[PDB]
Amino acid sequence: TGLLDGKRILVSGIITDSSIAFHIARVAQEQGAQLVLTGFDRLRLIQRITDRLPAKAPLLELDVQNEEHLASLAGRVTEAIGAGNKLDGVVHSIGFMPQTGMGINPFFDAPYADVSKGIHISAYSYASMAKALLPIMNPGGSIVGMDFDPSRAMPAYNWMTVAKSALESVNRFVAREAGKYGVRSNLVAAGPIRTLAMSAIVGGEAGAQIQLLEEGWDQRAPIGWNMKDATPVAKTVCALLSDWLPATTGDIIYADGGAHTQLL
Ligand SMILES: [C][C]S(=O)(=O)N1[N][C]C2=[C][C]=C(OC3=C(/[C]=N/[O])[C]=C(C(F)(F)F)[C]=[C]3)[C]=C2[B]1([O])[O]
Numbered sequence: 001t002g003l004l005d006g007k008r009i010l011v012s013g014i015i016t017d018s019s020i021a022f023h024i025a026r027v028a029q030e031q032g033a034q035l036v037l038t039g040f041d042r043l044r045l046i047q048r049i050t051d052r053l054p055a056k057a058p059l060l061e062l063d064v065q066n067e068e069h070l071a072s073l074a075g076r077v078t079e080a081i082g083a084g085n086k087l088d089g090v091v092h093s094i095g096f097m098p099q100t101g102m103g104i105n106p107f108f109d110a111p112y113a114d115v116s117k118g119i120h121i122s123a124y125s126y127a128s129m130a131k132a133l134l135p136i137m138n139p140g141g142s143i144v145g146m147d148f149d150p151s152r153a154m155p156a157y158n159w160m161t162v163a164k165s166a167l168e169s170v171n172r173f174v175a176r177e178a179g180k181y182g183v184r185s186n187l188v189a190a191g192p193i194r195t196l197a198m199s200a201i202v203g204g205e206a207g208a209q210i211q212l213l214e215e216g217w218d219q220r221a222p223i224g225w226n227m228k229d230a231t232p233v234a235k236t237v238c239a240l241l242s243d244w245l246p247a248t249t250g251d252i253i254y255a256d257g258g259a260h261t262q263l264l
Contacts, residue, residue, distance in 0.1 A: 221257025
């Protein structure tokens, strides 16, 4: 018997096999969840990444900036899940920020056009997705998004930090809307993870300062932190997807090795 036995969950944000969403999807399927996966612009290549998952899963096209995609998403999911069946979970693992708003680039030199695009994708889309999917969610359901603790400023992450701050605020309002359906809405604030996205930033002064953040994180974390292992994060997301945190919503769960509770 698995944690998510007989639950229908939509997982978005799977770009590579190193994406956090892939490990969330992997662990979810290991725990008995029936999945619906979304992607964009490389569905042939994405499906082949998806094929490495334990179980087969339908793949739907979703650009969270496309209003037509969002307006038809709910229906397209139903034609895949089956009529009379609803979703029990939605995982939002989508974030983006142009180079000008991250890395070694001066914080002031990021034009708003780039920042607005990042915030649309990283923060506003969380509400867009909730708006589209809540009608086809069962009571007791769970919406989960991804987060990186933005309560304090930091190097390199720059404007992505701001987009995460907005996301945290958006989540609290999504929770108000989700409550009417009996649905919870939460974020998982993870410690630093070596996704291909972040791995690129490290290589592409800033990269050294990222290493300083990574090193300091593991030391600070009372139980340690492995940036190469996304599994503890994925299990945390699955925990929120289950029925074992049923009184938690509009909230943030920190899967960071306990680093945010330690100063030094
Ligand atoms: C899920 C996709 S996402 O786009 O929306 N996203 N959300 C959560 C999230 C959580 C942790 C992350 O890892 C880091 C690292 C990693 N170092 O190895 C370094 C820094 C810093 F501050 F040093 F630059 C920040 C986050 C990345 C992401 B994220 O921005 O990819």
